[PDB]
Scaffold this active site. Structure first.
Site, PDB file in Angstrom:
ATOM      1  N   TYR A 177      -7.376   5.061  13.391  1.00 21.17           N
ATOM      2  CA  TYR A 177      -8.774   5.473  12.373  1.00 21.17           C
ATOM      3  C   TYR A 177      -9.932   5.525  13.154  1.00 21.17           C
ATOM      4  O   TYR A 177     -10.160   4.729  14.058  1.00 21.17           O
ATOM      5  CB  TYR A 177      -8.595   4.168  11.427  1.00 21.17           C
ATOM      6  CG  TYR A 177      -7.660   4.081  10.499  1.00 21.17           C
ATOM      7  CD1 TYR A 177      -6.476   4.776  10.279  1.00 21.17           C
ATOM      8  CD2 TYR A 177      -7.836   3.026   9.415  1.00 21.17           C
ATOM      9  CE1 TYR A 177      -5.367   4.625   9.649  1.00 21.17           C
ATOM     10  CE2 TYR A 177      -6.834   2.685   8.621  1.00 21.17           C
ATOM     11  CZ  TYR A 177      -5.578   3.457   8.676  1.00 21.17           C
ATOM     12  OH  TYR A 177      -4.495   3.432   7.955  1.00 21.17           O
ATOM     13  N   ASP A 191       6.090   4.571   4.796  1.00 22.05           N
ATOM     14  CA  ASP A 191       6.618   3.668   5.472  1.00 22.05           C
ATOM     15  C   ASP A 191       6.844   2.416   4.460  1.00 22.05           C
ATOM     16  O   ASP A 191       7.570   1.539   4.790  1.00 22.05           O
ATOM     17  CB  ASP A 191       6.382   3.530   6.965  1.00 22.05           C
ATOM     18  CG  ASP A 191       4.934   3.017   7.035  1.00 22.05           C
ATOM     19  OD1 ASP A 191       4.086   3.426   6.235  1.00 22.05           O
ATOM     20  OD2 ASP A 191       4.874   2.306   8.031  1.00 22.05           O
ATOM     21  N   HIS A 192       6.408   2.413   3.235  1.00 25.58           N
ATOM     22  CA  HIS A 192       6.605   1.038   2.519  1.00 25.58           C
ATOM     23  C   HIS A 192       6.503   1.493   1.060  1.00 25.58           C
ATOM     24  O   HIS A 192       7.417   0.770   0.364  1.00 25.58           O
ATOM     25  CB  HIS A 192       4.977   0.364   2.593  1.00 25.58           C
ATOM     26  CG  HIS A 192       4.646   0.181   3.938  1.00 25.58           C
ATOM     27  ND1 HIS A 192       5.425  -0.828   4.674  1.00 25.58           N
ATOM     28  CD2 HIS A 192       3.680   0.598   4.962  1.00 25.58           C
ATOM     29  CE1 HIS A 192       4.919  -0.833   6.104  1.00 25.58           C
ATOM     30  NE2 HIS A 192       3.865  -0.089   6.137  1.00 25.58           N
ATOM     31  N   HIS A 234       0.722  -1.229  -0.094  1.00 27.70           N
ATOM     32  CA  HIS A 234      -0.215  -0.104   0.099  1.00 27.70           C
ATOM     33  C   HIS A 234       0.943   1.155  -0.203  1.00 27.70           C
ATOM     34  O   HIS A 234       1.860   1.044   0.410  1.00 27.70           O
ATOM     35  CB  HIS A 234      -0.995   0.119   1.058  1.00 27.70           C
ATOM     36  CG  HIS A 234      -0.441   0.020   2.705  1.00 27.70           C
ATOM     37  ND1 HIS A 234       0.526  -0.872   3.460  1.00 27.70           N
ATOM     38  CD2 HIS A 234      -0.219   1.201   3.225  1.00 27.70           C
ATOM     39  CE1 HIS A 234       0.622  -0.393   4.506  1.00 27.70           C
ATOM     40  NE2 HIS A 234       0.426   0.908   4.559  1.00 27.70           N
ATOM     41  N   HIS A 260       1.641   3.904   1.662  1.00 25.49           N
ATOM     42  CA  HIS A 260       2.089   4.912   2.729  1.00 25.49           C
ATOM     43  C   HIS A 260       3.372   5.041   2.711  1.00 25.49           C
ATOM     44  O   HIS A 260       4.240   4.514   2.141  1.00 25.49           O
ATOM     45  CB  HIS A 260       1.672   4.121   3.959  1.00 25.49           C
ATOM     46  CG  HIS A 260       0.155   4.383   4.554  1.00 25.49           C
ATOM     47  ND1 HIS A 260      -0.591   3.886   5.353  1.00 25.49           N
ATOM     48  CD2 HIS A 260      -0.750   5.308   3.847  1.00 25.49           C
ATOM     49  CE1 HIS A 260      -1.639   4.344   5.411  1.00 25.49           C
ATOM     50  NE2 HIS A 260      -1.877   5.309   4.555  1.00 25.49           N
ATOM     51  N   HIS A 288      -6.704  -1.119   5.693  1.00 27.31           N
ATOM     52  CA  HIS A 288      -5.740  -0.300   5.812  1.00 27.31           C
ATOM     53  C   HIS A 288      -5.563   1.191   5.195  1.00 27.31           C
ATOM     54  O   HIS A 288      -5.189   1.958   5.599  1.00 27.31           O
ATOM     55  CB  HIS A 288      -4.160  -1.057   6.145  1.00 27.31           C
ATOM     56  CG  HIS A 288      -3.427  -0.158   6.716  1.00 27.31           C
ATOM     57  ND1 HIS A 288      -3.210   0.312   8.083  1.00 27.31           N
ATOM     58  CD2 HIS A 288      -2.213   0.611   6.138  1.00 27.31           C
ATOM     59  CE1 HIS A 288      -1.881   0.827   8.174  1.00 27.31           C
ATOM     60  NE2 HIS A 288      -1.525   0.950   6.992  1.00 27.31           N
ATOM     61  N   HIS A 325       5.063  -4.841   7.909  1.00 26.58           N
ATOM     62  CA  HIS A 325       5.772  -4.806   9.147  1.00 26.58           C
ATOM     63  C   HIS A 325       6.207  -6.229   9.601  1.00 26.58           C
ATOM     64  O   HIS A 325       5.116  -6.824   9.663  1.00 26.58           O
ATOM     65  CB  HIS A 325       5.311  -4.031  10.163  1.00 26.58           C
ATOM     66  CG  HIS A 325       5.093  -2.702   9.837  1.00 26.58           C
ATOM     67  ND1 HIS A 325       5.880  -1.529  10.046  1.00 26.58           N
ATOM     68  CD2 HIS A 325       4.101  -1.769   9.046  1.00 26.58           C
ATOM     69  CE1 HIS A 325       5.460  -0.385   9.754  1.00 26.58           C
ATOM     70  NE2 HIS A 325       4.490  -0.814   9.055  1.00 26.58           N
TER      71      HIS A 325
HETATM   72  C1  LIG Z   1       1.730   5.601   9.324  1.00 33.53           C
HETATM   73  C2  LIG Z   1       1.321   4.281  10.137  1.00 33.53           C
HETATM   74  O1  LIG Z   1       0.523   3.507   9.237  1.00 33.53           O
HETATM   75  C3  LIG Z   1       2.709   3.568  10.667  1.00 33.53           C
HETATM   76  C4  LIG Z   1       3.281   4.292  11.552  1.00 33.53           C
HETATM   77  O2  LIG Z   1       2.930   4.378  12.730  1.00 33.53           O
HETATM   78  O3  LIG Z   1       4.203   5.076  11.360  1.00 33.53           O
HETATM   79  C5  LIG Z   1       2.264   2.190  11.037  1.00 33.53           C
HETATM   80  C6  LIG Z   1       1.196   1.991  12.058  1.00 33.53           C
HETATM   81  C7  LIG Z   1       0.789   0.450  11.564  1.00 33.53           C
HETATM   82  S1  LIG Z   1       1.170  -0.856  12.583  1.00 33.53           S
HETATM   83  C8  LIG Z   1       2.726  -0.905  13.047  1.00 33.53           C
HETATM   84  C9  LIG Z   1       3.250  -1.484  14.444  1.00 33.53           C
HETATM   85  N1  LIG Z   1       4.853  -1.618  14.505  1.00 33.53           N
HETATM   86  C10 LIG Z   1       5.335  -2.898  14.463  1.00 33.53           C
HETATM   87  N2  LIG Z   1       4.640  -3.941  14.195  1.00 33.53           N
HETATM   88  C11 LIG Z   1       1.095   0.208  10.160  1.00 33.53           C
HETATM   89  C12 LIG Z   1       1.044  -0.853   9.452  1.00 33.53           C
HETATM   90  O4  LIG Z   1       0.269  -1.657   9.690  1.00 33.53           O
HETATM   91  O5  LIG Z   1       1.153  -0.607   8.272  1.00 33.53           O
HETATM   92  N3  LIG Z   1       2.286   1.256  10.051  1.00 33.53           N
HETATM   93 ZN   LIG Z   2       0.539   2.033   6.251  1.00 37.04          ZN
HETATM   94 ZN   LIG Z   3       3.125   0.882   8.023  1.00 43.89          ZN
END
Ligand SMILES: C[C@@H](O)[C@@H](C(=O)O)[C@H]1C[C@H](SCCNC=N)C(C(=O)O)=N1
Ligand SMILES: [Zn+2]
Ligand SMILES: [Zn+2]
Ligand SMILES: C[C@@H](O)[C@@H](C(=O)O)[C@H]1C[C@H](SCCNC=N)C(C(=O)O)=N1
Ligand SMILES: C[C@@H](O)[C@@H](C(=O)O)[C@H]1C[C@H](SCCNC=N)C(C(=O)O)=N1
Ligand SMILES: C[C@@H](O)[C@@H](C(=O)O)[C@H]1C[C@H](SCCNC=N)C(C(=O)O)=N1
Ligand SMILES: [Zn+2]
Ligand SMILES: [Zn+2]
Ligand SMILES: [Zn+2]
Ligand SMILES: [Zn+2]
Ligand SMILES: [Zn+2]
Ligand SMILES: [Zn+2]
Lengths: 267, 267, 267, 267
Positions: free
Chosen positions: D190, D87-88, D83, D85, D159, D224
């Site tokens: 959310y 961080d990906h 997706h 976002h 998500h 993650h």
């Molecule tokens: C922008 C957000 O989507 C991002 C953030 O908090 O910076 C993280 C939060 C959740 S869950 C992440 C939990 N961490 C390790 N398992 C998430 C994901 O599920 O992709 N990314």
């Molecule tokens: Zn995300």
């Molecule tokens: Zn994420």
């Protein structure tokens, strides 16, 4: 009573759609388009570059000619353009989908390409093609390099705001050949004076004539080969009558000046 | 061992973020930005025009000031830009969503705006903002009209390739006031000579100084008000020390020439 | 030998291009398209909404009808779409340029709209139109409000991935009229089974029949009026034979099931 | 008085930015991201595929790891995404510029990617990255093939609207290994019920749990790694505690149901 008119297709002379076998221009450079529309393939050690594609329906033919030259679809690395009109950039979208090539173009060409030629400054929506996105925006004088071969962009606005000449040095018989792929300099049916969509049109054309005159230019080619006096259909003698850059610019300026005077005289 | 660095935010002097009440510039023209970032509202019989928005976080403040001037969000018809950097076009996306305004800009500004300022020729990805699309592409010298008020674009590339001056004639005390909103002429940390991403940078700056000198210009304003010697915070005396277009161009060229010589001297 | 084929234009039955005067559907809602293509104008206290525009050459006619209804070009606030095919979204680009309206559409419609209908899942590049950008991306069930009138999107993928029904409550004779503008449910020449460009096509169509059945629906209209048994050309009796949403979905599913069986039988 | 706030950067835990050497997942598949962000490289006879890139500042590291695996920048053919976002998909724009890869993604991911994550349904403009364009739009169930390796998209909205699981069959010890790269199923902060920007959010999440449960799944990985109980930092034992698809969906649904009840209880 009268219904609204049907949409009309952009049609062209048969020779613009007449396939030809690859015609060698220099050691790495081949004309692989049709008899009357240029599409140049430059083959490097690290992939091929395509300069222009011609009409939208030429996509399959170009891939056939690329295969004849040993270039598989995935081997096409880069597409460059003279300008983003249907008869020169027509098949870019389909080529990108089928090859993975990237397009490099200046901002003006990029925005016209992404409209598929719609809302053209002069043609409106009459001459359109499938939209495509530019992957790299280039600036005047910027160098794009593939497999060691350096292509330099020279902006020559007029025919379109994004009109570009591309230059590079190939070889033939051990000697360098400075190739100039100079864009169109015509103004087909354009309003030249006081055009609200292009207020500095005359000034841009005038500067572009001078730009073409000064290009590094051992061998000139043009998007319509007749503009530089090429005859692709005769094979090895195709370049014999080709114009210099100086003569191409001079002929274009004389045609422009005559058209401008005719516009002042109402025709 | 060291992790990769965290992302760093684009931060600015506090005065660039300091709200101010609307300050009248002429009969229809108001500064409605912050103390140190220009955002001009021009109010016509058929809606309002906004020239620049400043930083991304200024969107709400601009709407507040528009309301103080009697302009509801839906009354904003058009957004124009000096150039598409985060500190001048920052809130354009949000303003479009919240007002229904259209953006008019040249092709260079449009492509940078649509990247949110990313892949900047000089800044890379360091100074970005929410991307926005241009709805109308304009050419050099083209006139955009709202409520009878005619805005003319004058391209002055350098600070960005799409840098634009906007001119229009307002009134004050029954007399016409030719306003010139001239873009930035700085080159902050730019490599000027032999820049591969901007090979004709020096030539463009030099032409742009001449363009600014020749603008129709009874009253000059600039995206950073200090560049034209405005002091928005003093209210009615804010324009007293303002530069002419001639003096703004001269100061900018002298600064540019000094910077160029320093670059040759390695600093 | 044979040249490559000429480009062919998207042509349609004359009645799809036959102008008609505005036909009132409810207190605020007017059909302002042609005899055989729906284009709905909804007039509010704070501007007008347009649902579909028909063919590209209908732009001028729609503006004429808007003027007959008292809606100046700048009074058009919003364009909504059933789906982004040339015969329904054809004039969107030109309307945006000429009115300042924004387009709201789901992500699938937005990406097809921005390609001008090119690279269609089933039609390829055969049926195209000037590309346009969506200004607001909407999600299934999301409410878009203009002048207090609330339009709700109901995704019904199949005919295109972005196919949308729009619902709103108008009035007539003091009573509410729940209007459902349900998208097309045809699959014209589509490969239904094992389509690599649309692997879940059958599942989406099946769900969309159920979606249409459940729409709030006192009065059904469709992009092609014959699909819901309207006859725009007879004026006040145009709605007399109109189908319910239940009957529209049932007829479409029976046609789909028959087509699917014919595809299994090779025709 | 208070100036407007400074822009704030998207910051993350140090381990999300901690480089790691390539970790083999199956015969052709390598984790080449950081300790706590997945980026999968699949190496074929005709080029490499990248699934996710992590944060924007990971671009250089990914290229370093690709080089360690024998993949030059030009050898990267295709980028796929879970997706869009920060961080990906953070480094997608830079990777496209530096490799010539194409991006394939569904329409929802494409429109969010092209906004650089701005105007996020839940995050607004708080978590953004350089925008990038999708070159191929894919549909649910569509197969993308590189070097004979077939990747199948499985839409699992929630998500983000464009959230996608990608599946493919690799090998290990002569036996097939059905890999499932399932997207995130979290709903971080959310609003779940009655969200005007996502009215069917709960219904989409619920369907997506079922989608994940039914994926072909000998080995599950997630954007993650902790979500599927991987521990990239321990090397060869990194997969030992990995969850099945069934257990990943079950844990996510239980977390979702608890969050939903807490939302009803005001927290
Ligand atoms: C922008 C957000 O989507 C991002 C953030 O908090 O910076 C993280 C939060 C959740 S869950 C992440 C939990 N961490 C390790 N398992 C998430 C994901 O599920 O992709 N990314
Ligand atoms: Zn995300
Ligand atoms: Zn994420
Ligand atoms: C859309 C137009 O730009 C296109 C057309 O007429 O279809 C032609 C007209 C001129 S000049 C072509 C003259 N033909 C052979 N030399 C032109 C060009 O200079 O690129 N293309
Ligand atoms: C991103 C940069 O362009 C921005 C910044 O430093 O944040 C400034 C630097 C110069 S000059 C500004 C000088 N300050 C007051 N006159 C500049 C401009 O001329 O527009 N904006
Ligand atoms: C491009 C096509 O989608 C278009 C065309 O044939 O030109 C038509 C075909 C079907 S059904 C139309 C049947 N005509 C009257 N009811 C259709 C629709 O359902 O929207 N549009
Ligand atoms: Zn042309
Ligand atoms: Zn031409
Ligand atoms: Zn700037
Ligand atoms: Zn600035
Ligand atoms: Zn259709
Ligand atoms: Zn139709």
């Amino acid at each position: 009573e009268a219904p609204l008119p049907q949409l009309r297709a952009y049609t062209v002379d048969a020779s613009w759609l007449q396939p030809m076998a690859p015609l060698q221009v220099a050691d790495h450079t081949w004309q692989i388009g049709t008899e009357d529309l240029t599409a140049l393939l430059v083959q490097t050690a690290e992939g091929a570059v395509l300069l222009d594609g011609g009409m939208p329906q030429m996509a399959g033919h170009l891939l056939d000619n690329m295969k004849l030259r040993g270039v598989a679809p995935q081997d096409l690395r880069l597409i460059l353009l003279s300008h983003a009109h249907a008869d020169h950039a027509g098949p870019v979208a389909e080529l990108k989908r089928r090859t993975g090539a990237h397009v490099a173009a200046n901002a003006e060409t990029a925005v016209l390409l992404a409209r598929g030629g719609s809302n053209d400054l002069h043609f409106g929506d009459g001459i359109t093609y499938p939209p495509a996105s530019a992957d790299r925006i280039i600036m005047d004088g910027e160098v794009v390099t593939v497999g060691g071969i350096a292509f330099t962009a020279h902006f020559m606005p007029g025919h379109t705001p994004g009109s570009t000449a591309w230059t590079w040095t190939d070889t033939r018989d051990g000697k360098p050949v400075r190739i100039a792929y100079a864009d169109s300099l015509s103004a087909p049916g354009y309003q030249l004076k006081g055009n609200p969509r292009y207020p500095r049109l005359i000034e841009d054309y005038k500067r572009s004539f001078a730009t073409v005159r000064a290009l590094p230019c051992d061998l000139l080619l043009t998007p319509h080969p007749g503009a530089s006096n090429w005859n692709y259909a005769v094979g090895s003698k195709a370049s014999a009558e080709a114009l210099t850059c100086n003569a191409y610019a001079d002929a274009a300026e004389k045609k422009f000046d005559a058209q401008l005077a005719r516009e002042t005289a109402g025709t």
